[PDB]
Paper text:
Like the G-form structure, the ZFD also adopts an extended conformation in the Apo-form structure. Structural analysis suggested that the extended ZFD conformations are mainly stabilized by crystal packing. Although ZF3 and ZF4 are also present in the Apo-form structure, they are disordered, suggesting that they don’t form stable interactions with surrounding molecules. In contrast, ZF2 is well defined in both structures, due to its extensive interactions with symmetry-related molecules. In the presence of RNA-12U, Arg179 and Phe311 pack against the RNA and adopt a stable conformation, while in the absence of RNA, the side chains of Arg179 and Phe311 are disordered and flexible, as indicated by their high B-factors and weak electron densities. Interestingly, however, the relative orientations between the Exo domain and ZF1 are very similar in the Apo-form and RNA-complexed structures of TbRND. ZF2 adopts an extended conformation in the Apo-form and the G-form structures.
Compared to TbREX1, TbREX2 and TbDSS-1, TbRND is unique, as it belongs to the RNase D (RND) group within the DEDD exoribonuclease superfamily. Like E. coli RNase D (EcRND), Saccharomyces cerevisiae Rrp6 (ScRrp6), and all other RND family proteins, TbRND possesses a single 3′-5′ exoribonuclease (Exo) domain. EcRND and ScRrp6 possess an HRDC (helicase and RNase D C-terminal) domain at the C-termini whereas TbRND contains a predicted CCHC zinc-finger domain (ZFD) at its C-terminus. Depletion of TbRND results in extended gRNA tails in vivo, whereas, overexpression of TbRND leads to a substantial reduction in the total gRNA population and the subsequent inhibition of mRNA editing.
Numbering used by the authors: 49 to 341
Write the structure that this text describes.
Amino acid sequence: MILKYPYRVVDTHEKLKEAVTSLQGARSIALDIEAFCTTDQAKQLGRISLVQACSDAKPVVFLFDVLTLTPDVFVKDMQSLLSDREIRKLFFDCRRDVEALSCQLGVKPEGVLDLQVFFTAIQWKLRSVNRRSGMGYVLKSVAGLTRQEGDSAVQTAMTLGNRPVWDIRPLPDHFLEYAAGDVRHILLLSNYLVGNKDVPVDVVAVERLTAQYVEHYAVGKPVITEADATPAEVNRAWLERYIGPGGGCHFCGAKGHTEAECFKKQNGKAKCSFCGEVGHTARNCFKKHPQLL
Ligand SMILES: [Zn+2]
Ligand SMILES: [Zn+2]
């Protein structure tokens, strides 16, 4: 259902006020950004072009045209809901987005939850894995969904990065569709990760871990020293402090997998040489030895 939310372009002051009114009623708001491609293709996001929002208060994806509205008009109406710690702001890897909000818009969001960090926290608690996984892998592992990929032309342009890409006005439909996709996926993901008994990590602990990332990356200037040893992982000391010791396989003792994934466990089960069933040996097989039925 969330996957079918339509988008609405917010590029006037009137539309901005209506969107803010909707978002103020939410408990959670999924957030994302489209920025100008940079010729350097540097860590810091380029000029903010869109901010995207999808909340649990209304079936819609808001595409805020910051370029058109201007950051000053956008921030003035969005600042308080972004600073409102009672409204959860959901991100999938918030690091560069937070830095762009701080540097370009002058705002530090409060009440952030990073769902990519959430998935890694689970991988840490269960397997001592601190790797960050991409959106497609997380959607499949958590929700079972195969992510529809963005328009390949939009993706090619961004990978080339020899032009801004997102400066074009009006935006073509497949650019707007591309821009709306991830915040749908983020709100959908929060349904599986937040308020779920079967998730082996407290949401509050991932809120505290995420807050370390917001504090590190919202400092009003470009971040030089990264929080993580490589871009594709989560600081191990932060995981130990907020999530706890890393886990491992209860069956063989190794880190990196769980007992449900353990090859030694499955391969070590008795397998009947006579009928092939797992769980009993041929000596105990009723089919081979009817004198046992
Ligand atoms: Zn094992
Ligand atoms: Zn048998």
